[PDB]
């Protein structure tokens, strides 16, 4: 599993969960939001070598094709597998509003 | 949709469905299939700019984060959306065998 447990505790140049903090006002220009001020979104990055955390038959086949013919640029990509929501607080005038935004945090990765 | 209809009829440097015909013997070294000799596997490649065919909220947010801070290497990645099976024929001696291999062909793309 390409999760925090493995990825953050070990050095990896192939597809792995990478840490990333997003500050709303700084990084996105979202001035409408009260709380939190940012979050640990994380991202998926790294090489997709032959059979490394392959999602579907197509990714298995391409990891192989791209081992043989790298020139074609047809490699599978390092992407999100498991995601988590992020609870936000924002105001409509004096009115506080609690919203759940789904699939905001990436928890695990895969090669697709 | 990032399918054949759009992608093959238009020039795009951004995430799009790319044509790819994989030859069994030449490209993968699979000498066991009788028919077909290869197949239009296709692949997904290209840039994932702000709000271009975003999969999840995370993909939307990171398309934005990566517009602001490209240096972080946190860009969403061009990946498979709709997958289709491939029907093959192989022989066990004189016995013909028909197999549907699932998720062999990519029909559309997404930025994840």
């Amino acid at each position, epitope marked *: 599993a390409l999760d925090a447990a493995y990825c953050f505790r070990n050095v990896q140049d192939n597809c792995c969960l990478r840490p990333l903090y997003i500050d709303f006002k700084r990084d996105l220009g979202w001035k409408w939001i009260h709380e939190p001020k940012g979050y640990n979104a994380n991202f998926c990055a790294g090489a997709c070598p032959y059979l490394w955390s392959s999602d579907t038959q197509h990714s298995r086949v391409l990891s192989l094709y791209n081992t043989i013919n790298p020139e074609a640029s047809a490699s599978p990509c390092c992407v999100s597998q498991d995601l988590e929501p992020l609870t936000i607080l924002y*105001y409509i005038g004096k009115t506080p509003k609690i919203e759940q935004l789904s699939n905001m945090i990436v928890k695990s990765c895969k090669c697709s | 949709a990032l399918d054949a209809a759009y992608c093959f009829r238009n020039v795009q440097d951004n995430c799009c469905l790319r044509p790819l015909y994989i030859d069994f013997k030449r490209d993968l070294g699979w000498k066991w299939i009788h028919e077909p000799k290869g197949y239009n596997a296709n692949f997904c490649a290209g840039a994932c700019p702000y709000l271009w065919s975003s999969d999840t909220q995370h993909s939307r947010v990171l398309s934005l984060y990566n517009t602001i801070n490209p240096e972080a290497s946190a860009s969403p990645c061009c990946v498979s959306q709709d997958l289709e099976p491939l029907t093959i024929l192989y022989y066990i001696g004189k016995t013909p065998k028909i197999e549907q291999l699932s998720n062999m062909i990519v029909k559309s793309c997404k930025c994840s």
Partner: antibody, heavy 119, light 108 residues
Framework: VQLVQSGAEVKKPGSSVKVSCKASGYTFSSNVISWVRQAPGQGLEWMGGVIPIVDIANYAQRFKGRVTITADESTSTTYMELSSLRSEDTAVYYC?????????????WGQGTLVTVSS | TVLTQSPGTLSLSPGERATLSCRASQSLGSSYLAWYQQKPGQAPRLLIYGASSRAPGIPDRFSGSGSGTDFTLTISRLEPEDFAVYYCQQYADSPITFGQGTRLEIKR
């Protein structure tokens, strides 16, 4: 920044209208769109708004019930739909970008969209 | 929240000073009121936000003040282009409400 609205429309009574508002790219990613109407020889009426990037809409109470404000992720466009059209809905409809908050002052305005309700 | 603008019509000559009033049915604090200028067949133009801040590019002759329920827009050295309708807007409480408008006509 420029907000470009769809052209003037004529709608039969009882019908519905969808008014669009295209924005200058990254003012969808960070801004809030408000919808305001002005009936002939009248003041301004706030209808509601939307946070385009997350598609969260908020309405004025007299407008929920006939209004829907939506965002089109791709096209960088906000839509406002008003249904069960009556003669009193003949007005100029404006979209506007807010200063930052959901309820805020509006700095950028679209040119307006005249919706005439007539048989 | 109800915003009452006064007078309904204000008659002045170029070079004069205009004093427009907005009275709110309940407290709006000091950062939740804006002023707009609307010329015939055009969209409203934001002049002042947060009771006293001039919006980007707005001439210095426009100024706002007030807190709680009483707000004021002051236009100095009136230009002919300033003869228009002025509205006040509150964004302290949902829904956003506007004033009825104040027409600024030429006196004769």
């Amino acid at each position: 920044v420029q907000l470009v609205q769809s052209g003037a429309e004529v709608k039969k009574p009882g019908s519905s209208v969808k008014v669009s508002c295209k924005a200058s790219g990254y003012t969808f990613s960070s801004n809030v769109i408000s919808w305001v109407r002005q009936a002939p020889g009248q003041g301004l009426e706030w209808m509601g708004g939307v946070i385009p990037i997350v598609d969260i809409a908020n309405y004025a109470q007299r407008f929920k019930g006939r209004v829907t404000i939506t965002a089109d992720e791709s096209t960088s466009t906000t839509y406002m739909e008003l249904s069960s059209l009556r003669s009193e809905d003949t007005a100029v409809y404006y979209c506007a970008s807010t200063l930052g908050l959901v309820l805020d002052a509006m700095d950028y305005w679209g040119q307006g969209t005249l919706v005439t309700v007539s048989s | 929240t109800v915003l009452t603008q006064s007078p309904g019509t204000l008659s002045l000559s170029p070079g004069e000073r205009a004093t427009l009033s907005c009275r709110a049915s309940q407290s709006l604090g000091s950062s939740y009121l804006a002023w707009y200028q609307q010329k015939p067949g055009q969209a409203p133009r934001l002049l002042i936000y947060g009771a006293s801040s001039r919006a980007p590019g707005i001439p210095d002759r426009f100024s706002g003040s007030g807190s709680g329920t009483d707000f004021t827009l002051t236009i100095s050295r009136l230009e002919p282009e300033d003869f228009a309708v002025y509205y006040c807007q509150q964004y302290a409480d949902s829904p956003i409400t506007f004033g009825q408008g104040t027409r600024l006509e030429i006196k004769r």
